[PDB]
Write a protein that binds this ligand. Sequence first.
Ligand SMILES: CCCCCCCCCCCCCC(=O)O[C@@H](CO)COC(=O)CCCCCCCC
Ligand SMILES: CCCCCCCCCCCCCC(=O)O[C@@H](CO)COC(=O)CCCCCCCC
Ligand SMILES: CCCCCCCCCCCCCC(=O)O[C@@H](CO)COC(=O)CCCCCCCC
Ligand SMILES: CCCCCCCCCCCCCC(=O)O[C@@H](CO)COC(=O)CCCCCCCC
Ligand SMILES: [K+]
Ligand SMILES: [K+]
Ligand SMILES: [K+]
Ligand SMILES: [K+]
Ligand SMILES: [K+]
Ligand SMILES: [K+]
Lengths: 103, 103, 103, 103
Amino acid sequence: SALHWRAAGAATVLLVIVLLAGSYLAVLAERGAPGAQLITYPRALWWSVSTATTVGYGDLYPVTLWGRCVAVVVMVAGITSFGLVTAALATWFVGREQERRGH
Amino acid sequence: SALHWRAAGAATVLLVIVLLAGSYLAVLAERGAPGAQLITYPRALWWSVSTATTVGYGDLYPVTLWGRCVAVVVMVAGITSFGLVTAALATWFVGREQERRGH
Amino acid sequence: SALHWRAAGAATVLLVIVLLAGSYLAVLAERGAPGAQLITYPRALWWSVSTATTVGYGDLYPVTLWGRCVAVVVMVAGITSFGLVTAALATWFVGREQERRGH
Amino acid sequence: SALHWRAAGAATVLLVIVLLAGSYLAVLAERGAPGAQLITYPRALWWSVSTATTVGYGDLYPVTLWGRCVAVVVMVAGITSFGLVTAALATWFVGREQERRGH
Ligand SMILES: CCCCCCCCCCCCCC(=O)O[C@@H](CO)COC(=O)CCCCCCCC
Ligand SMILES: CCCCCCCCCCCCCC(=O)O[C@@H](CO)COC(=O)CCCCCCCC
Ligand SMILES: CCCCCCCCCCCCCC(=O)O[C@@H](CO)COC(=O)CCCCCCCC
Ligand SMILES: CCCCCCCCCCCCCC(=O)O[C@@H](CO)COC(=O)CCCCCCCC
Ligand SMILES: [K+]
Ligand SMILES: [K+]
Ligand SMILES: [K+]
Ligand SMILES: [K+]
Ligand SMILES: [K+]
Ligand SMILES: [K+]
């Protein structure tokens, strides 16, 4: 099992862990802030995933410092995780082309 | 026809299929939810494509569990599909540079 | 001048052309649609760039079929253009590591 | 220390500098525009980071020419910086696969 595939797998599991951890921590950070909407777990998970994919509909978002810090972590984990999948695909293609070239 | 170009082509066709399937399933999942707006097919397709590209204007979004699950599938298919195109471009450039180096 | 750098340069010029063309065509497609906001050129250019980078604040967006089609073109051009820059960076790094390995 | 890792490190520091500089300049550009909301530094930094990651919730955005120009710089720096991290990961994977192939 090549490194890039293992890394891709691990990245996926870690992202899921971050999305989960982020939804809990977001609710923890946001309750107590008048007007906050990221305060129940199910929609917080929806918020986490739509932030990690960087879609950001804006239907939900953090208003506190720690909620936003949590958000940045979720964003970075999502961007780098998917970026890593891209990197693994590149490695796969590069390898196949070398073979196709007799190497 | 190198693998990366075939993969890029296939990824494109699959994405189109997902955007189509996602618009139908989104409407199916969202009707029945008071207040939902992702309920007619044309705008649902607009929603699907703007989600797959991860643009997310927020003019439309799912409010139900299954609509959101459908959304996650659309997001992932879009991100990985475009990511794959990037990976194919990298393979193309890597190959040309090797040649430019006499290999 | 290696291919990837030339491609990166060309991609940048083309993107600028698309952003420009997209702002004109968006206004052309949207005027005539009651309620449309993407109807003056300066903000249309702001809309084009924030769509191409896939940021999508949602302060502006197309409501017509052709405005949305124009949007999809802008999105794709932005994603693939930046993706190509990424691919060129990968080629640059791959080349330097080979050298660092005595190849 | 291979180039790609140094580049990745430098890209990260530069991005942080841009996010910081962007929040100051955004407030500078936006105050004086009736209705503008990107006018206090803490939320401006939140705006900068959520723009650089291209998340774009839409809770905050620039309304002036220079605020939007600043925004474009932030967007580009974010996209290219994360793109570079992706490129570095690809180089790392490519290198490990070559070794795994006895090269
Ligand atoms: C540490 C933080 C952990 C957070 C864990 C969240 C646990 C929530 C229970 C799970 C589902 C509840 C369903 C429900 O009745 O809610 C629906 C109401 O319409 C839709 O809600 C939602 O928006 C849920 C969508 C979740 C999408 C997840 C995509 C993951 C790739
Ligand atoms: C399985 C799910 C399938 C969903 C299929 C959708 C079929 C809809 C018929 C198609 C067009 C109708 C036009 C119309 O009169 O609508 C216009 C009204 O202003 C604009 O609407 C729209 O927003 C359509 C924009 C579609 C963009 C698609 C981009 C694809 C890359
Ligand atoms: C084919 C379509 C072509 C469209 C061309 C657009 C021409 C507009 C003239 C240019 C500037 C006008 C300034 C003004 O007085 O407007 C300011 C008002 O606050 C800010 O406006 C704006 O939002 C302009 C922001 C533009 C950002 C462009 C970023 C490019 C990478
Ligand atoms: C040149 C421009 C420089 C701009 C520098 C900004 C300096 C602000 C001081 C820092 C924190 C203040 C906290 C506070 O009391 O504010 C909180 C109020 O709820 C949350 O605010 C916020 O939204 C801050 C979130 C910042 C996230 C940064 C993520 C970086 C990767
Ligand atoms: K995005
Ligand atoms: K976005
Ligand atoms: K958005
Ligand atoms: K938005
Ligand atoms: K919005
Ligand atoms: K809104």
